Amino acid sequence: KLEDVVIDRNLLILGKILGEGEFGSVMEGNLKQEDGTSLKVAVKTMSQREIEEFLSEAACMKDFSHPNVIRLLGVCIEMSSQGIPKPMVILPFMKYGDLHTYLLYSRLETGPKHIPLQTLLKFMVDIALGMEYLSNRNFLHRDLAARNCMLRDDMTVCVADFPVKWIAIESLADRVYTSKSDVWAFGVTMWEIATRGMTPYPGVQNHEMYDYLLHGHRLKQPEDCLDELYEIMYSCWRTDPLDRPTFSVLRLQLEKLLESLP
Amino acid sequence: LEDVVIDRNLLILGKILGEGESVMEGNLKQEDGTSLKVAVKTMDNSSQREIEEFLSEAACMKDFSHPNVIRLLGVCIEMPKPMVILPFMKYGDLHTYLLYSRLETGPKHIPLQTLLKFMVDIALGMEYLSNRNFLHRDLAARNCMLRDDMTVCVADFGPVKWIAIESLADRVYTSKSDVWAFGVTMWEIATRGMTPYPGVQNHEMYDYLLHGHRLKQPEDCLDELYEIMYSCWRTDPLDRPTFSVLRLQLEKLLESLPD
Ligand SMILES: Cn1cc(-c2oc3ncnc(Oc4ccc(NC(=O)c5cccn(-c6ccc(F)cc6)c5=O)cc4)c3c2-c2cccc(N)c2)cn1
Numbered sequence: 001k002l003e004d005v006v007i008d009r010n011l012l013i014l015g016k017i018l019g020e021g022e023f024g025s026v027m028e029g030n031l032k033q034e035d036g037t038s039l040k041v042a043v044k045t046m047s048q049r050e051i052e053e054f055l056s057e058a059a060c061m062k063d064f065s066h067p068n069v070i071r072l073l074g075v076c077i078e079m080s081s082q083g084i085p086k087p088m089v090i091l092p093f094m095k096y097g098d099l100h101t102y103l104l105y106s107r108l109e110t111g112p113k114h115i116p117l118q119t120l121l122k123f124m125v126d127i128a129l130g131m132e133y134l135s136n137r138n139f140l141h142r143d144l145a146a147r148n149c150m151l152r153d154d155m156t157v158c159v160a161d162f163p164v165k166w167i168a169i170e171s172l173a174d175r176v177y178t179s180k181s182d183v184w185a186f187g188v189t190m191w192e193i194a195t196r197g198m199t200p201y202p203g204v205q206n207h208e209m210y211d212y213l214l215h216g217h218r219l220k221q222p223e224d225c226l227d228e229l230y231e232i233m234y235s236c237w238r239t240d241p242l243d244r245p246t247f248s249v250l251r252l253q254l255e256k257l258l259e260s261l262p
Numbered sequence: 263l264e265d266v267v268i269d270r271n272l273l274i275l276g277k278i279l280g281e282g283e284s285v286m287e288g289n290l291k292q293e294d295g296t297s298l299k300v301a302v303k304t305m306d307n308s309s310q311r312e313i314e315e316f317l318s319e320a321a322c323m324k325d326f327s328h329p330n331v332i333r334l335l336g337v338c339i340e341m342p343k344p345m346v347i348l349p350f351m352k353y354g355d356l357h358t359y360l361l362y363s364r365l366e367t368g369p370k371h372i373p374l375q376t377l378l379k380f381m382v383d384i385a386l387g388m389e390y391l392s393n394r395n396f397l398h399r400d401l402a403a404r405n406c407m408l409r410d411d412m413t414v415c416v417a418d419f420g421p422v423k424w425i426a427i428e429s430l431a432d433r434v435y436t437s438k439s440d441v442w443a444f445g446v447t448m449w450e451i452a453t454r455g456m457t458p459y460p461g462v463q464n465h466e467m468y469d470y471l472l473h474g475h476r477l478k479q480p481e482d483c484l485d486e487l488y489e490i491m492y493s494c495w496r497t498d499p500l501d502r503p504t505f506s507v508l509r510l511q512l513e514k515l516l517e518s519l520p521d
């Protein structure tokens with residue numbers, strides 16, 4: 001259940017805040033490894049059922065191994081002074097942070113260097129490689145977005161999960177979720193990357209989203225987005241879920257597109 | 263006061279264009295018999311009603327005249343909710359226009375020379391307003407409006423990242439605080455609609471400024487253009503330029519560029 005994923009609270013040292021809000025709090029931390037060495041980590045803390053659902057999320061994350069899906073380093077159990085459990089999820093710390101902030105930063109002079117096309121396409125390939133993995137596992141992500149993608153120390157992206165505009169039209173009206181709903185969100189993520197941090201659908205408010213989409217309107221081709229990267233991303237927004245490509249078809253579409261450019 | 267009000271008969275309300283906690287399209291019948299497309303913003307607190315002091319705003323502003331300041335065609339009184347009548351502008355607000363420029367099926371890619379014109383435009387309007395000793399107190403690319411001829415005029419639909427550091431700690435507003443909002447708006451334009459201070463939340467903003475940190479130079483911003491907007495963010499208000507000085511620096515920079 002939680003055996004081999006639980007870490008004794010003694011082995012964790014919490015530091016400053018990385019980000020706060022209404023998905024808990026994520027902070028830097030030191031994790032004492034059975035190696036005897038210490039490791040830099042991100043510890044996301046946060047209610048009766050929200051506790052067990054929190055531990056339920058580490059369930060069907062405990063055993064996920066792919067270079068493009070975020071690793072779990074463990075779960076912790078902190079006892080309140082009142083004795084209530086306070087669950088904590090432990091992740092490897094990533095100095096480069098989430099992809100959304102990194103895309104915006106690239107447009108500033110003192111942030112990361114200007115990201116070329118080949119690198120933006122590798123960003124999507126990484127997400128495609130990982131979501132393809134998670135699709136084979138028959139795991140529904142349901143929150144795919146640039147803000148949820150983390151950058152590894154080797155500048156490879158990995159999928160994670162800390163929002164109407166990333167939700168497929170079929171899931172908006174009827175509260176359902178298929179693998180194809182995930183694929184719709186992937187199309188929006190490639191839009192964020194190709195726009196380098198733009199909020200989806202400029203000009204349209206959240207409450208109009210279902211109707212905007214019900215009238216056949218889709219995200220606009222980003223300026224300087226090449227005319228075949230847009231088809232791959234537009235293919236994720238077909239109205240029938242069954243008519244959308246699979247994560248494995250998309251990945252190849254991006255891989256062979258990447259190695260056509262110099 | 264009166265003599266700036268218009269009869270509700272000569273106004274016809276249409277669909278909503280935006281809403282807070284509202285702007286509607288409409289038609290206005292004018293003295294010359296013609297009908298003009300207008301925006302109608304419908305505002306207040308009535309337990310006690312400083313509309314007496316708001317008609318002042320509508321009065322003091324409806325007799326200003328400058329190409330880079332929005333025209334106010336008058337006020338309409340309905341019994342009671344006041345409504346403000348502005349000319350309709352198909353190109354809409356500048357913020358939404360900048361983002362559109364980065365997408366095909368939208369206004370074409372704005373070159374830097376045109377982007378400087380948007381800046382010159384705004385500085386001109388604020389030079390006019392500050393010479394009349396008028397305090398905007400909310401200047402941003404969202405509050406700017408694009409005329410039928412491509413031209414920006416200052417308005418206020420009626421914002422921590424745009425507020426100056428002196429106005430955060432204390433609550434003082436001066437023409438120097440508006441100059442701070444100008445440099446942020448300049449940064450908005452150079453980034454074609456980026457939210458200020460990526461990576462910083464709103465609660466950190468005051469602490470972020472008190473440590474000497476400012477907005478970062480855009481990916482392609484000329485050094486001279488970053489120097490002008492950086493002047494707007496000096497920690498001492500008395501060391502920031504005035505809108506008249508600012509106007510001439512942007513006009514000289516813009517004319518130094520190729521056509
Ligand atoms: C400079 N800087 C750096 C950083 C920073 O570094 C980091 N390193 C690591 N994690 C970081 O946050 C996190 C924290 C938790 C997660 N996830 C889960 O907990 C999780 C749980 C249960 C299940 N799943 C899951 C679901 C579906 C899947 F398919 C796979 C997994 C999950 O993912 C992902 C990221 C950061 C950050 C940070 C912190 C706060 C805000 C921001 N914006 C960045 C900050 N500033």
Ligand SMILES: Cn1cc(-c2oc3ncnc(Oc4ccc(NC(=O)c5cccn(-c6ccc(F)cc6)c5=O)cc4)c3c2-c2cccc(N)c2)cn1
Nearest residue numbers: 279280285301303346349350351352354355416417418419
């Ligand atoms: C495609 N599209 C286009 C449009 C659209 O067209 C338009 N035409 C005209 N007004 C438009 O809204 C307005 C409405 C009111 C104002 N202001 C005042 O009322 C005002 C009052 C009292 C005082 N002051 C003032 C203060 C300081 C000054 F220095 C000067 C004046 C003022 O300003 C400015 C804009 C639009 C829009 C619209 C509508 C909704 C949302 C968005 N985002 C755009 C929509 N969609």
